Subunit: 82 residues, 4 copies
């Protein structure tokens, strides 16, 4: 049993309305300390060889479903459940 | 300068349509190894005393904007940018 | 061929951090005319009897996947593609 | 008082992982009638001249906050609350 962690974000360089909105709404409420906000989708996949082979598999999941390379960047962390 | 990381999820015990959907769509495509999926929103707040005081501040941001305790659970990690 | 439209929102009475955030960020930028914001997920399902029977089917999709009654309210519109 | 409705979607031609996922998870559960799914974010803005002038204003909100033209397409409907 392994836990794969998939972080998905917008391509580097693409402005993110969600981040910008959170920032401004935060400053609006008084938190002027907040200088910048960014958001991501975190996807935890719990699945059944070894971590490198798992990473390969989720890599495929991303490639053909989870993320769109044109607008998305993503990264995968695989930890064995012990 | 500090980087506060806010993870927001649904209350423990509430079924999440997104997780369930991802799982089934994943099994549907062949990845029968995938046994369970869960999703979270990750919010990175870059802001300007010390980490415990920062955590207190984002704690407030959550309390009055970022998350709704009725339907949300959340956790905060604060790292000093060095 | 029919187009089913599924609108999903938070239960009536549950505060929505997204709506609140958008509002404040909007006022923050100058749009003080904006008095209130609300957000929804719109899901267009294109599928293959008649509209009432389709509505029944998507009703089931919602019931067992698309939405969680505990935290979600939803409504379904079915139009025949002509 | 007017209700502006903002529909935001991915640019025409960009594959949407959410839509694809919903479709497959739906077929996976038996709903083979479902042939295609698409998703959108609906944003209802309740605000305070006349509908054409309101549309202009939300147009600006979109242009500078709500949506990113590079990855987003959007449309605005303005109805006077009567």
């Amino acid at each position: 049993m392994y836990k794969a962690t998939v972080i998905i974000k917008l391509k580097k360089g693409v402005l993110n309305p969600e981040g910008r909105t959170i920032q401004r709404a935060l400053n609006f409420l008084g938190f002027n300390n907040v200088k910048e906000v960014q958001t991501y989708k975190m996807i935890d996949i719990i699945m059944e060889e070894n971590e490198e082979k798992v990473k390969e598999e989720v890599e495929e999941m991303c490639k053909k479903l989870l993320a769109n390379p044109v607008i998305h960047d993503y990264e995968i962390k695989v930890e064995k459940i012990e």
